[PDB]
């Protein structure tokens, strides 16, 4: 009956929702946090027993790094987790193009290091292991929609690194009988999403424009199409995969496709502005119909050298085997994110 | 791109305590200031966001940031090649001594090999004769001190994975200077603090905890070795010394310090006096506690988890050489530093009890 | 025009044949050699201009390592090759299970290091890059036979590392227009093959048994089936891929399949011994009919945790587009290897 | 009983002599060997129980690398050594200048990895650890002669990396009470010395000239001065340091200084030739007085950008506490190395 989770990447979007979910289920939750010159725990600070004194209760934190083999062994050996969720990563696709080696060492080799730490600790038989796989693996998609058996075609050093991680997880599963699974999750956003992913960038910018604190912002490829769900729904799927009798990989997604362009339009609609588009390519601009003011421009610096044009997930296997369903759909996702960021910018024009 | 009158700095570790003060110092001298920032799942630029041209939109002016990491050789070459700096300040590091004992390999890779990676990037870009290089060395190099006080010629005796990694960095910097005639210097800076100090260094831990106790947000906090003695100065004074070392006619290494020693115990006592509380110590070793004389409440305890397996008992810097050659003088003394940090953290905690 | 080749892995089996092949065409051939406590250039010492003094002519060696980014940039900037062959790797599958992280750093991240070095030197439009990809990418084969479009399924830390390299190569090709190709070569052997690969282990042991220097040796999985060609034929295909008008990936193979058991049988037949099998699984032994002497046993320490049971390559594409044709078939490969090792072992019983 | 040694760097000069030394004392001796495309065990292949079959007796080898933490932990857990000698290193000073990062990773961080592996394996209080420190730490010497209290002043990426390793060993000793020692050994040579160190380079070249297999060879800085002893004497001091009651660091040296130029002159005298020098700097040549033929030239490519001009060790502490004393002196070392290489080159002009 002992339920002890270890979350790498606990400070990120998904880790903070997953920590809450597992705490709610009575888990003792351990996380690995990077040393940083300022604290990086803002998403999970409310999960201290005393947030004012930063005293831990059932969520306990450990300094560590996915590139330091010894610290991972020490932490796993001390914690003896029953479930490990490897969410730690350099997770940004655009940044990965000029941080390609660091991204490989953390996202790819770092997964190996965590798996070898489990094995070193004698826990291959005692641990269930979740790997944060990603729809970026499909890249230039080879099937539509994409399912567990769709061949991968990565399009960034991030995708390539996660492809390494995916297969080394399969190899520990097959070679050593580790209960280890690849959650092949499609894009998921929330009010806690990193600020330079495209959805949170739009909702942040629309909020600042609404409050008169920003006039305009620049985007990259407006025509990219994504399957977007809500991170809070998706972390439950991660836990469900570790409850399955057999270790299996699952696609987690909504199966509904929308463009970056639509996210922009729906976001502005919630602050009472109708965006109309002018021009083409890097000279395209989005203008408020009601005021005539230009609020969106295009800057090639936000483009990727090898774009991922289209993603649409088929989560049939998860729905059948895990009884999982997405709760939040695209329209509600956009409203929630814009409203959250409006309330945030009201408190702090520098947020 | 290089010409006389064009001053372009590249700061690794720009988001840290020193990097934030040094960015301000160089900006006000009219430098174009570039910084390398780690990718982070939330933003880590809190110390320098006020240096955006537009802090509401986070639009850059004369401070320009770049994603990178000292463990990624290619990214360092790309950034240096793009920026073509005249001055490079390598402040980026896993800088915490206690954490380094259980993060030993990461600390070696960043603080030791990362210095070589940055030096090697300068050479790869063909800029050996175009850049001046500042290395963030440290009084932790003296460790178990072989002389008192410590100066440039005092032999090093490191006492942590942090100290060993910074020792590698110190000497690989000397080697690039001697082998390739790079203008590269080691600033051997003794401890320096500020209201921007990391929260888990001992000074900021005390001022934060005293501030929270003052405000009823905390009743008691634990320290480690109360008897450690340190040479403590102010980070804003010390970043000025980094710049002066790069203005020197020849590349020399310099100790930078106050020369005045105080114990952790004394920092605790002075901090509590600023909120009107006198601490009286009872007990010994891990059972020692500090009690408020006026109220009888125990506010300080000792926890062995904050000890270090190999402590650095005593540090005292002799900066005679820098006083003579750089005309550098510390401005903030220990008493003022304590007052400034307690006062700043009282304000912080009153505004945000979760800070 | 200029023909300047840089070969990583020049001391290995393939590098030694490729160096000879390019030298014959008038290339200046540079190689990267690891620092070793003894010399590791035995396969290429005959290509010094003066072998007694080890003075170089048109083959020029450079100390380096695929894990040292700065050293790779210095070498590429000095050599400015027109053609790069990334053959350097920890290439042994069984050893990769105990050396998983080193294998990842050299075979996967090391390929990224070499590509980034090309880019750092400004040579992205000035060099043609060959990557030593491998039939091990197919692992648990998803199609029979296997061709360029067969979905991958790696089965070792080696396979996973090479799959990262495969895809980071594609990404540099697609992102920066680097002329980069994956040669998907199936198993290829020679008298220069590493001694602990299965074919050379057999030819070496048969040679020692013929000379009375050995009585018996042990293998692992006798039922494994492989597509085996000759390394000298296959390095020609590498060069042809870089002569192609456009950067394409190519399978290189014979399309014929034999078992490890069959390799044993044919090798022993060349020293006039008929191997007859008796027993099953780990107790199976091979006995010489003529003499009744046991010469082959099974030791499970040579098994792999996730075996690759069957490989068979379809090189239709390379035959049509490159006019490549293997000239050495399985039976001639066996004769040649046993013949060469008999001569070697006669000269030196400790070889 | 129980005497189980683990030697990293067992294939090198010192590891080969140390293996024999420990085997004679009845140790079970384990080595870590790097995977290489051809075998790298030539110095130790006579220590197989059956050297023709390469079957192990009391010397047992394990594939590994000082940059792969997991493999280090696995080997130490399996072997459970009582004594660990960390001799593995990129040990060449000139190569370290353009292989600076790899040399840091192996010689510096690799030492921490091996120490951390000892700690991870729970052997911090049972194993005795020998670190292969070096007189290169003294670099630009601050005292003559150099002893334990002489301050370090490294002059290469090799020296800096070894200086990190020196102090991290001290830190594990002081922090965790690990019995760990630094052997501060001055230069030591033998007929097994790496061919591109200056002494073996000379004896190889003089031997070839004696056999009419070579006419001339080039050197670097002829006036460098060194304390040279015999590796076979020095490995005994390593063992003695781990027999000491308390873990202490020791200088090991002969206290006698000779120049590279003297090594040349004495080596040629052993083949009946008197070298007379003419010219300066890179134009200096060494001519046989009896014949007038030039046999030695200077090439700046063998210079180092930061030379270590002079080394002379004072091993008073070791003589008093360990009772160690060198047996082979400079004249005997020169004659031994020339004679061995004459016998070697007789067998093979391409050796
Ligand atoms: N969100 C999606 O749509 C999506 C889809 C599929 C897969 N994924 C993957 O799912 C996981 C979580 O997604 P997220 O959106 O929560 O990403 P995130 O917000 O970027 O969180 C990333 C986490 O990884 C940590 N981390 C980064 N480098 C590390 C290192 N070297 N050692 C240890 N920890 C390190 C970060 O720590 P700091 O806070 O210190 O930076 C943070 O805790 C990631 O692996 C991501 O790649 C995301
Ligand atoms: N303060 C002292 O008393 C003192 C005395 C002597 C020497 N030093 C040295 O002086 C320098 C600055 O001191 P500080 O007090 O400013 O330390 P700090 O506040 O800890 O700042 C450290 C900086 O280094 C960055 N960094 C950490 N790991 C990195 C990596 N892998 N790649 C790139 N950047 C990385 C941090 O970025 P994040 O914000 O992303 O963590 C932060 O910007 C450090 O090198 C420290 O070791 C300090
Ligand atoms: N032979 C096959 O059947 C086959 C099939 C497909 C693909 N491959 C791949 O094709 C390539 C050549 O095959 P091979 O049979 O010639 O392999 P090999 O005989 O094992 O040669 C391997 C080469 O890589 C070098 N190397 C190893 N680690 C290195 C490092 N860290 N930095 C630099 N160089 C390093 C080795 O140098 P040392 O001599 O110093 O070890 C050697 O030169 C390899 O990448 C292999 O994986 C082979
Ligand atoms: N000889 C001297 O005068 C002297 C003086 C003081 C200190 N030292 C140090 O004493 C030790 C032995 O001296 P030596 O002359 O015997 O050096 P050596 O002949 O160069 O032997 C070096 C050994 O280290 C191994 N090695 C290299 N890189 C490795 C890695 N990444 N992982 C694991 N093993 C690796 C080599 O393996 P390969 O065979 O695979 O290359 C070889 O076994 C070295 O640490 C050297 O730096 C030497
Ligand atoms: C290093 C940074 O890279 C960024 O690009 P990068 O992450 O791609 O992110 P962007 O796409 O440029 O902006 C995405 C969102 O992040 C916000 N943002 C950017 N920087 C900061 C910051 O420092 N603090 C806060 N609270 N929000 C920031 C910005 O307002 C926008 O809503 C640049 O916008 C910055 O000027 C800087 O150069
Ligand atoms: C990972 C963290 O390591 C810490 O140890 P560690 O850094 O040595 O730091 P400590 O010496 O325990 O605490 C020093 C100061 O850091 C503050 N602090 C600690 N954690 C946080 C945080 O998450 N956010 C903020 N704003 N302030 C924090 C704490 O209130 C105190 O003023 C533990 O105190 C924490 O509970 C947690 O385990
Ligand atoms: C480290 C070594 O790993 C090996 O396993 P590993 O490579 O899988 O190689 P094996 O499959 O055991 O043997 C394959 C062939 O390599 C030869 N061989 C093995 N070791 C050596 C050697 O040191 N020198 C030479 N010239 N030939 C060697 C062996 O005779 C056989 O023909 C073990 O057989 C050895 O005893 C040792 O443990
Ligand atoms: C990579 C090699 O670097 C070397 O420089 P590097 O190690 O500094 O070594 P050197 O100082 O040039 O030569 C030292 C001794 O090594 C021998 N030697 C050099 N290369 C080899 C080899 O491949 N096999 C054998 N058996 N002996 C070799 C050479 O005869 C001489 O006796 C160059 O001499 C080579 O031409 C090549 O470039
Ligand atoms: N991050 C980001 N993405 C953008 C931007 N403009 C367009 N996009 C596109 O939005 C899509 C989603 O990007 P992102 O939120 O970073 O998540 P990703 O699917 O992992 O790449 C990608 O196709 C981007 O190219 C922008 O300004 N920032
Ligand atoms: N960080 C920290 N240091 C403490 C604590 N208690 C005592 N010290 C001592 O205060 C001295 C200064 O520590 P620190 O502020 O981390 O800076 P350092 O000089 O680089 O080690 C060291 O000797 C510590 O052992 C504590 O709770 N936290
Ligand atoms: N290396 C090796 N392989 C063996 C042995 N016994 C059976 N095999 C099998 O032979 C097949 C070819 O192995 P190998 O020559 O190492 O090349 P690989 O195809 O890259 O794995 C694999 O399926 C091995 O499992 C053995 O003793 N050594
Ligand atoms: N390796 C090497 N060293 C040389 C040569 N010529 C002069 N030397 C000098 O001989 C001294 C000893 O060099 P080496 O044998 O490599 O051992 P080291 O003490 O570790 O540098 C150094 O000062 C070298 O600069 C040469 O051709 N090769």
Domain boundaries, chain D: 1-193+229-256+308-328, 194-228+257-307+329-351
Residue D181: half-sphere exposure toward Cβ, Cα within 13 Å: 27
Q: Is C52 exposed, middle or buried (0-12, 13-18, 19+ CB in 10 A)?
A: middle
**Phi, psi (rounded to 5 degrees) for B167:** -70, -45
Q: Are D19 and D231 a contacting pair, CB within 8 Å?
A: no
Q: Which of B164, B187, B65, B172 is nearest to B118 (CA)?
A: B172
**How far, in Å, is the centroid of ligand 10 from the Cα of B305?**
12
Tell me: cis bond preceding D2? Omega within 30 of 0 counts.
yes
Tell me chain C's radius of gyration from C-alpha atoms.
Answer: 20
Give the angle D41-D44-D47 at the CA atoms, nearest 5°: 130
Which is the catalytic residue, given B21, B31, B89, B162?
A: B162
Check if B60 has its Cβ closer than 6 Å to any atom of ligand 5: yes
Distances (CA, A) of D198 to D154, D224, D280, D281: 19, 10, 20, 17
Q: Are C91 and D58 a contacting pair, CB within 8 Å?
A: no
- C12 to chain D, minimum CA–CA distance in Å? 6
Whose tokens are 């042991």? That residue is C205
C70 in D contact zone (CB under 8 Å): yes
Concerning whether A158 is annotated as a catalytic residue, the answer is yes
CATH of domain D194-228+257-307+329-351: 3.90.25.10
- C110 to chain A, minimum CA–CA distance in Å? 9
Q: Is C203 exposed, middle or buried (0-12, 13-18, 19+ CB in 10 A)?
A: buried
Task: Give the resolution to one decimal, in Å.
Answer: 1.9
Q: How far is CA D70 from the centre of its chain?
A: 26
First to last CA, chain D: 41
Cβ contact B171–D160 (<8 Å): yes
Q: Are B75 and A98 a contacting pair, CB within 8 Å?
A: yes
**Yes or no: domain D1-193+229-256+308-328 corresponds to CATH 3.40.50.720:** yes
**Phi, psi (rounded to 5 degrees) for A316:** -55, -45
From the CA of B59, give the closest atom in ligand 5: 36
What does the alpha-carbon distance between residue A250 and residue A237 come to, in Å, rounded to a whole number? 9
Q: Are D203 and D214 a contacting pair, CB within 8 Å?
A: no
What does the alpha-carbon distance between residue B104 and residue B92 come to, in Å, rounded to a whole number? 16
Where residue C157 falls (left for φ over 0; alpha for ψ -120 to 50; beta otherwise) is alpha
Cβ contact B101–D154 (<8 Å): no
Check if B160 has its Cβ closer than 6 Å to any atom of ligand 5: no
**Probe ligand 5: pick from A196, A205, A220, A349, max atoms within 8 Å of CB?**
A196
Pick from D68, D102, D350: which is nearest to C101 by CB?
D68
Q: Which of A192, D151, A34 is nearest to B155 (CA)?
A: D151
Which is the catalytic residue, given A136, A189, A236, A265?
A: A136
**How far, in Å, is the centroid of ligand 2 from the Cα of B91?**
5
Helix/strand/coil for A274: coil
Task: Write out chain D residues lying below 8 Å of B141, CB-based.
Answer: none
Best D65, D112, D120 residue to mutate vs chain A (most A CBs within 10 Å): D120
What does the alpha-carbon distance between residue C240 and residue C253 come to, in Å, rounded to a whole number? 14
**How far, in Å, is the centroid of ligand 4 from the Cα of B110?**
25
Report the residue numbers after which chain D has a gap, meaning the C atom sits over 2.5 angstroms from the next written residue's N, or none: none
**Probe ligand 2: pick from B16, B105, B242, max atoms within 8 Å of CB?**
B16
Cβ contact D174–B155 (<8 Å): no
Check if B53 has its Cβ closer than 6 Å to any atom of ligand 5: no
D143 in B contact zone (CB under 8 Å): no
Pick from C12, C38, C65: which is nearest to D102 by CB?
C65
Q: Which residues of A301-338 are buried (b: 16+ CB within 10 A; e: fewer)?
A: eeebebbbebbbbbbebbeeebebebebebeebbebbb
Q: Are C346 and C279 a contacting pair, CB within 8 Å?
A: no
What does the alpha-carbon distance between residue C232 and residue C21 come to, in Å, rounded to a whole number? 8
Helix/strand/coil for D336: helix
Helix/strand/coil for C21: helix
What does the alpha-carbon distance between residue C189 and residue C192 come to, in Å, rounded to a whole number? 8
A197 in B contact zone (CB under 8 Å): no
What does the alpha-carbon distance between residue B265 and residue B228 come to, in Å, rounded to a whole number? 8
Residue B317: half-sphere exposure toward Cβ, Cα within 13 Å: 26
Residue nearest atom 3 in ligand 10 by C-alpha distance: B202
What does the alpha-carbon distance between residue B272 and residue B211 come to, in Å, rounded to a whole number? 9
Helix/strand/coil for A84: strand
Would the annotation count B216 as a binding residue?
A: no
C295 in A contact zone (CB under 8 Å): no
CATH of domain B198-232+261-311+333-355: 3.90.25.10
What does the alpha-carbon distance between residue C107 and residue C165 come to, in Å, rounded to a whole number? 7
Tell me: cis bond preceding A145? Omega within 30 of 0 counts.
yes
Q: Which residues of C113-148 are buried (b: 16+ CB within 10 A; e: fewer)?
A: bbbbbbbbbebbeebbbbbbbbbbbbbbbeeebbbe
What does the alpha-carbon distance between residue A106 and residue A122 come to, in Å, rounded to a whole number? 23
Residue in chain B lying closest to A98 (CA): B75
Residue nearest atom 18 in ligand 9 by C-alpha distance: A93
Token readout for C105 is: 């750093």
What does the alpha-carbon distance between residue D81 and residue D2 come to, in Å, rounded to a whole number? 9
Distances (CA, A) of A84 to A214, A241, A312, A322, B11: 42, 12, 28, 19, 37
What does the alpha-carbon distance between residue B287 and residue B267 come to, in Å, rounded to a whole number? 19
Q: In what order do the strands lie in the sheet with A275-278?
A: A217-219, A294-298, A285-288, A275-278
| HEC-encoded secondary structure of A299-318 | CHHHCCCCCCCECCECCHHH
Give the angle C125-C127-C132 at the CA atoms, nearest 5°: 125
Q: Which ligand is nearest to the CA of B45?
A: 5
Distances (CA, A) of C348 to C42, C198, D346: 15, 21, 16
Which is the catalytic residue, given D158, D166, D210, D234?
A: D158
Pick from D101, D109, D157: which is nearest to B105 by CB?
D109
D168 in B contact zone (CB under 8 Å): yes
Tell me chain D's radius of gyration from C-alpha atoms.
Answer: 20
Whose tokens are 């493999």? That residue is D71
Would the annotation count B35 as a binding residue?
A: no
Check if D204 has its Cβ closer than 6 Å to any atom of ligand 8: yes
Strands D28-33 and D59-63: parallel
The DSSP 8-state label assigned to residue A50 in this structure reads: B
Q: Are B37 and B61 a contacting pair, CB within 8 Å?
A: no
The per-residue DSSP string of D81-121 comes to -SEEEE--S---HHHHHHSHHHHIIIIIIHHHHHHHHHHHT
Cβ contact C306–A157 (<8 Å): no
Which is the catalytic residue, given D82, D103, D111, D134?
A: D134
What does the alpha-carbon distance between residue D129 and residue D7 come to, in Å, rounded to a whole number? 10
The per-residue DSSP string of D116-183 comes to HHHHHTT-TTT-EEEEEEEGGGG-S-SSSSB-TTSPP---SHHHHHHHHHHHHHHHHHHHH--EEEEE
Roughly what angle, to the nearest 10 degrees, separates helices B17-28 and B235-247? 60
Cβ contact A40–B40 (<8 Å): yes
Strands A179-185 and A250-252: parallel
Name the helix (H) or strand (E) containing A164: helix A157-176
Helix/strand/coil for D248: coil
Which is the catalytic residue, given A138, A158, A164, A166?
A: A158
Cβ contact B116–D104 (<8 Å): yes
Pinpoint the alpha helices (H) of chain C.
13-24, 69-79, 93-96, 100-103, 110-120, 157-176, 198-210, 231-243, 260-270, 316-322, 330-347
What does the alpha-carbon distance between residue C152 and residue A151 come to, in Å, rounded to a whole number? 8
Q: Are D91 and D231 a contacting pair, CB within 8 Å?
A: no
Q: Are A166 and A131 a contacting pair, CB within 8 Å?
A: yes
Q: How many CB atoms lie within 10 A of CB A138?
A: 28
From the CA of B67, give the closest atom in ligand 5: 1
Would the annotation count D153 as a binding residue?
A: no
What does the alpha-carbon distance between residue C290 and residue B264 come to, in Å, rounded to a whole number? 87
Which is the catalytic residue, given C28, C83, C111, C136?
A: C136
Q: Which of C24, C291, C328 is nearest to C193 (CA)?
A: C328
B78 in C contact zone (CB under 8 Å): yes
Give the angle C281-C282-C287 at the CA atoms, nearest 5°: 90
The per-residue DSSP string of B112-173 comes to IIHHHHHHHHHHHTT-TTT-EEEEEEEGGGT-S-SSSSB-TTSPP---SHHHHHHHHHHHHH
Concerning whether D134 is annotated as a catalytic residue, the answer is yes
Token readout for C127 is: 């060099």
Tell me: cis bond preceding A141? Omega within 30 of 0 counts.
no
Q: Are C307 and C173 a contacting pair, CB within 8 Å?
A: no
Distances (CA, A) of A349 to A284, B349, D266: 28, 21, 81
Q: How many CB atoms lie within 10 A of CB B61?
A: 12
Residue A135: half-sphere exposure toward Cβ, Cα within 13 Å: 28
What does the alpha-carbon distance between residue C264 and residue C221 come to, in Å, rounded to a whole number? 12
Q: Largest Cα–Cα distance of chain B, in whole Å?
A: 66
Q: How many CB atoms lie within 10 A of CB D317?
A: 18
The DSSP 8-state label assigned to residue D28 in this structure reads: E
The DSSP 8-state label assigned to residue C94 in this structure reads: H
What would be the CATH architecture of the domain defined by B1-197+233-260+312-332? Answer: 3-Layer(aba) Sandwich (3.40)
**Phi, psi (rounded to 5 degrees) for D26:** 85, 15
- A246 to chain B, minimum CA–CA distance in Å? 32
CB-defined site of ligand 11, < 6 Å: C 93-94, 136, 187, 196-198, 201, 219-221, 224, 226, 260, 302, 304, 307-308
Residue in chain B lying closest to C109 (CA): B72
What does the alpha-carbon distance between residue C318 and residue B2 come to, in Å, rounded to a whole number? 51
Q: How was this structure determined?
A: X-ray
Q: Which long-range contacts (CB under 8 A, 24 or more apart) does B215-220 make?
A: B215/B346, B215/B349, B215/B350, B215/B353, B217/A52, B217/A53, B217/B349, B217/B353, B218/A52, B218/A53, B219/B297, B219/B299, B220/B298, B220/B299, B220/B300, B220/B301
Roughly what angle, to the nearest 10 degrees, separates helices D157-176 and D110-120? 20
User: CB under 8 Å to C103, separation ≥6 — which residues?
Assistant: C90, C95, C96, C157, C158, C161
Check if D45 has its Cβ closer than 6 Å to any atom of ligand 7: yes
Cβ contact B99–A35 (<8 Å): yes
Cβ contact B16–A35 (<8 Å): no
What does the alpha-carbon distance between residue B66 and residue B61 come to, in Å, rounded to a whole number? 14
What does the alpha-carbon distance between residue A117 and residue A119 come to, in Å, rounded to a whole number? 5
Distances (CA, A) of A174 to C94, C331, D70: 15, 35, 19
What does the alpha-carbon distance between residue B252 and residue B179 come to, in Å, rounded to a whole number? 15
What does the alpha-carbon distance between residue B102 and residue A11 come to, in Å, rounded to a whole number? 20
Concerning whether D136 is annotated as a catalytic residue, the answer is yes
Task: Write out chain A residues lying below 8 Å of D120, CB-based.
Answer: 70, 73-74, 120
């Amino acid at each position: 009956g002992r339920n002890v989770a270890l979350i790498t990447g606990i400070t990120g979007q998904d880790g903070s929702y997953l920590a809450e979910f597992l705490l709610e289920k009575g888990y003792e939750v351990h996380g690995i946090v990077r040393r940083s010159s300022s604290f990086n725990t803002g998403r999970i600070e409310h999960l201290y027993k005393n947030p004012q004194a930063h005293i831990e209760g059932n969520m306990k934190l450990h300094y560590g790094d996915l590139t330091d083999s010894t610290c991972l062994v020490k932490i796993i050996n001390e914690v003896k987790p029953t479930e490990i969720y490897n969410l730690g990563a350099q997770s940004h696709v655009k940044i990965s193009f000029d941080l390609a080696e660091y991204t490989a060492d953390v996202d790819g080799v770092g997964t190996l290091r965590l798996l070898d730490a489990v094995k070193t600790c004698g826990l291959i038989n005692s641990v269930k292991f979740y790997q944060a796989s990603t729809s970026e693996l499909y890249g230039k998609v080879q099937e539509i929609p994409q399912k567990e058996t769709t061949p991968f075609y990565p399009r960034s050093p991030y995708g390539a690194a996660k492809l390494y991680a995916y297969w080394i997880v399969v190899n520990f599963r097959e070679a050593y009988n580790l209960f280890a699974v690849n959650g092949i999750l499609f894009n998921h956003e929330s009010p806690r999403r990193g600020a330079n992913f495209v959805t949170r960038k739009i909702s942040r910018s629309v909020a600042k424009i609404y409050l008169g604190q920003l006039e305009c912002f620049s985007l990259g490829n407006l025509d990219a199409k994504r399957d977007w769900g809500h991170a809070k729904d998706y972390v439950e799927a991660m836990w469900l995969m570790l409850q399955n009798d057999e270790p299996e990989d699952f696609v987690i997604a909504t199966g509904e496709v929308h463009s970056v362009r639509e996210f922009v339009e729906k976001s502005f609609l919630h602050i009472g502005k109708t965006i109309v588009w002018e021009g083409k390519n890097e000279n395209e601009v989005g203008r408020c119909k009601e005021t005539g003011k230009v609020h969106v421009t295009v800057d090639l610096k936000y483009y990727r050298p090898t774009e991922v044009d289209f993603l649409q997930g088929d989560c049939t296997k998860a729905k059948q085997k895990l009884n999982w369903k997405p709760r939040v759909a695209f329209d509600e996702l956009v409203r929630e994110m814009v409203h959250a960021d409006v309330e945030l910018m009201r408190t702090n024009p520098n947020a």
